[PDB]
Structure formats: C-alpha cells, structure tokens
C-alpha cells in the first residue's frame, strides 16, 4: 500500500541540481510540474525508507511519529500526478497547491524531528547512537533539499524564488551579528563588538558577492556568532572586558571563506566535535512561560544544521579551537554557481549497511 | 619459512606504550629485554604484511625490496632470543647489540620508502594509489614506533632516552624556526620575520614545558616553517615586502596547541589535503651535483610524517586555509603524559580488507 509506494521510489537515486541550474530555470511552470512530480516522491520516498530503521523507541515518539505521517500524506498527495497531462492546465494549478499545501505541513520538520530526539533521550543507548548521528545529518540534509524545491516552485509560481544572483556577503554577515548581539545582551547583559574585515582577491577593492541563498548565509553566521559570544561572555565573565569577534572575508578564485574568531576560551580537540553532535546537544526547549532570557546555546541543532547548510551546496563549516585561548570557526562556500552542487543523501545498500553494521586496523587507546 | 615467522608474530597485536610507562621505565635492562623481544618481532611483522599487500609495480622497486630486506634481516636476528634465558648475561648484551645494529641497519628507512614511490611512480593508477595512501600512513607510523623502541633501549642501555620531561616548547619553536629561515634565506634571498606568542592557561606567566620527544615537535615545527615561509615568499615576491609568520602556543587543560600563521596566499579547499597525499607530493630529488639551492617543498614527506608525528602519541596537525589570503597550521600535543598513548597500526583482517575493497550512500558530484 503505503510500503509499496514508498519502495517504487526509493529504488530511485534523488537527482542533485547545481545553483546555476536553479537559476537558469527560474531566470516555466510546466517544465517545473515534470521535474518535480518525480523529483519530491523520490526525495521524500528515500528518506522515508531511513526513518523506518530508527531505533524502535526513537521512531515510536509522538514527534518522530508526526513527522513520518507529514511525509507519508505528501508522498500520497504528490503520488496524484504520475499520470496527469503536463498539457492539462488544472493538473499544472493543483501541483502548485499541493507545493504550497506541502510546504506549510512541512513548516515545523526541523524542531519537530528535535523534539522527537529529546522523548527518546527523556524516556530511554551508545550502539544504536551512531545511527541516530548518521540519520540526522541525512534527514535534515534531505529537508534542506527538499525545502529547496518547494521554496524554489512556490515562489516562482505561487532574486529567483530564493537564490540571491548577487548576495551582499558582508550585509547578511552584519544582520546576524547584529541579532545575535540583540539575544546577547539580553542574556549577559553586555556583548562583543565586531570587528570586520574583508578581501576581495579575486578583484581588490570590489565588493564580495556570490550567487547563494541569503537565508542559508544568515543562518549559519548568526549561529556561528552565537556560539562565538556565549564562549566570550561566559570565558571573560570576571573580567568584565570583552574581547570583539573578529571576522574576515575572503573571496578567491574558487572560495568564499568566511573565519570568525574568538577569545572565548576555547575547547580541547576531545570534545569539539561534540558541538556537531546531535544526541550531546539534545536540550529540552525553554519554557514559554517565562521572562527570563533565552540562552544562546541549547535547543533546535543550530550548529550541525549551520554545517549542513554550508555543505548542502559542497562548502563546508569547520571548527578548530587552541583550549585556553579561542576558537576559529571557517564557512566555506564555493565562488561559482556552476561548482554549487546540491549534496543529497541517497537509501540503497550501503546506507542500509550503515545502521546494521558495527577489530579495528590500528590499537585501542 | 621467514613466512612462517611473520605469520606467527603478526597475529599479536603490538602492544602500545602511554609516555608516562616511556619515562617511568627509563626513570632495568632485563626488563626491556624481556618487553622488546616479543614486541620489536610483533611490530616488525605486523607492518611486513602489509609491505606484501603493495602493488606488484611498488613492492618490487629495488628500494622497497631494499627496505623488505631490512626489515626480514632484523626479524630473524630478534627470533634468535626467544629461547634464551633473561637471567643468561651475555643474552642480554646481545640483545642490546642486536638493537644497536638494527638502529642503524634502518637508519634511511623514510628515504628509501619514498625512493621506491619515485621508482614506482616513475616507471607505470588511481585505484591502488589508495592503497598506497593507506599504507604509507600505515608504514611510516609503525616506523616513527620501531624507532622509539629502539631509541629508548639504545640510549638507556648502550633527558630519559630520547623523552625530555621538561621539553621547553618556545625554544624548540625557535631553533625550527632559525634553520627554516637559513633555508628560506638560500633560496629566497629573504625571509619573513617570526612573531612568536605564548599563554599558559594551566598556570600564567610560567614556562610552557610538556613532557615530549623535542626531535618530534621539532620536526613538525621546522616543517611547518619551510611551509608558511614558501608561501609567503612565492605569493608576496612582485611586493618584496613579506608578512611575518604569527606563532601562538597555548598550554591548556588538556591539549597543548601551536598555531603557526602565514599571510601566503592560501589554497582552495579542494586541494589542501594534496599537502598530505603522498602520490601527490612525491618529487625526485634534488641532484647531488649542484651548488643551486634546495627549494623548501619536495622530497621527502615532510609534512605527513609532521602529521603522524603528533598523532603518534595521541595529538594531531591540521591545515586550514583562507584562499586568496593565508593558511593556519595547528599542531595539537596532549598536555598530560597519562593521555600520551602509541598510535600503532595492527595487521589484522580489517587491514586486509582495506587493501581488498571498493554504490556511495550519498550522491555524486
Ligand atoms: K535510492
Ligand atoms: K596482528
């Protein structure tokens, strides 16, 4: 029934888009209809076979449980167009409905799916953890994706759709640093300056742009300077001097590199890696009910997902950090559209192989 | 015959040392001895099992099988004194002259593996260029452990050994930092200034001392040098006005950090890890014949052997690199001895497997 229609297009492998190909399409409604009407299935259905191998008490959360009816009723409801005519124009105007109706259903996914990690850990594992770790990553990278393609169809047919061909690099930059500082200083009560510097290699002098999603951009910086003035607050707290975050922008011939530095502290290398980690970052949100200040770190993996977000488009978000002293964290985004390829998580063999296989070549320490 | 002995003591597991046992030894020649002549077989048959996974092509380069030849010679002199008696003297002090020799025996190891790539490279592949990557990480390490032993054992019995309890970081930065600069001064007719900074976080204002092989962090200093200095003197020569390298040391914690900065011009993110490929940065050697100066990258795996140096007792050294603007090098060092393990490759059939193997669950781009 359900599994059948799930298994027919899971066979299939999702097909990545480049940014100049999201581009030079939105810069024709039916054309969209018939990528589309195969596309979202195989997405969907993919990542559905994946969410079926969840530890049993993780997939039977009331949350997890939502998330898979959301996708199971999008499936079904994309399913009603295999065998329409891309010719009859009713067929055109429902697919977009049901890109719109999809879009808003799937609002949530990403803070649903967190809650659902935080029942299991609330209710309940080391083994079956790694599976959690490798799952969430596919299935937050198959959402951004996917969020993609109903942004991109919705916008066009309900900057092209969401694709900036000239984002302001240092502009996104200065809007998540100035949010950031607003969460800040109503936590601390005080925040880190900026200090901002940027080169253009590619053309001295010129202004930085690439062709990007602003709001992928503004996420993962505003979440970076997050984490970055936590670490400062809380590092020179006695003090009560704060050193400024410091950020430099480079664009060369192939990379668009983004380092933000801090005097925060700093981490030992054993555990930075914790801060991409779903299950060690997995924190009961706050309670609404309250005046108190959030905190600028805690729930909904702004972290991991910032890393996704660069990677999605083959960049990449790293962090290394000299304990004692600061952390360096560094967005890499590639410069040409035609190098921005979508990185999409495929269900086959080896990602089943993945959850159901656990000496090693070199010496326990 | 010789298979039949390293097929016997490549089934051990060799035996990994924390620096803290290093030091506590040194800090009974019998006892070393009786360590050493199970475990110096172990290690040695453990790697020459994978010395015969190699490409037909490689492994019978004359100097791989120079090296194989080396390495079959000392196994069979330390299986001489598997039967004698710990008690028996001049046991003992053959043993100790066993050692001794096959120190020197294997004095050009590193070298002579590399001029066997050069023979191999030289003379005939992508696939097994993988296996060759794997390997060489595999060797290399398994000698840096070899060569501890014998070290130890030759400096006791022939500053604890080669260990120095109270290594002093920032002098050793400086001496990798004047022979660096003499190089760079050859070839380059000039050189960048060092601005060197230091944090004792453990204890501020203190000496920065770890308890380390100087000859090690040396040679990832020393190398990390020559390559920030490259850069900087091959992106900055139209200018003739060249950046310093920014060193900064932090004691921590737990980790011990140097952070080696150069304002080179940096490489793409795509190639950075071409600095630690050995297929990739495998050159001839200079000729003999020549008065003309030794260029600063080349022959001889400098920077992955700094790499497997730090790893070796549980650190690392990372790269990463704005492109268009300059390149940080981390070395990180445990700041405890107790933390400071052996990092030692085991032959096994998930070594096997790794040679015999290779649909992604990710698609491709
Ligand atoms: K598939
Ligand atoms: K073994």
Redesign the pocket.
Known sequence: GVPGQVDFY?????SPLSMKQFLDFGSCEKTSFMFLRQELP?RL??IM?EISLLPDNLLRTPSVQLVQSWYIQSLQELLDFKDKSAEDAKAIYDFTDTVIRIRNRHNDVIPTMAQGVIEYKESFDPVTSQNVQYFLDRFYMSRISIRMLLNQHSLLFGHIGSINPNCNVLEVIKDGYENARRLCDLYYINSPELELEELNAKSPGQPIQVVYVPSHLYHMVFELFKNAMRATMEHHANRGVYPPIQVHVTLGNEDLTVKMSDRGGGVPLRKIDRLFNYMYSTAPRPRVETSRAVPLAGFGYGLPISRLYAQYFQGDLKLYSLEGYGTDAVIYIKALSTDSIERLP???KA?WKHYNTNADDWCVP
Chains 1, 2 share one sequence.
């Open positions: 899971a066979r299939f492998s999702p195989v259905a993919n076979k495929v269900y086959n990602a």
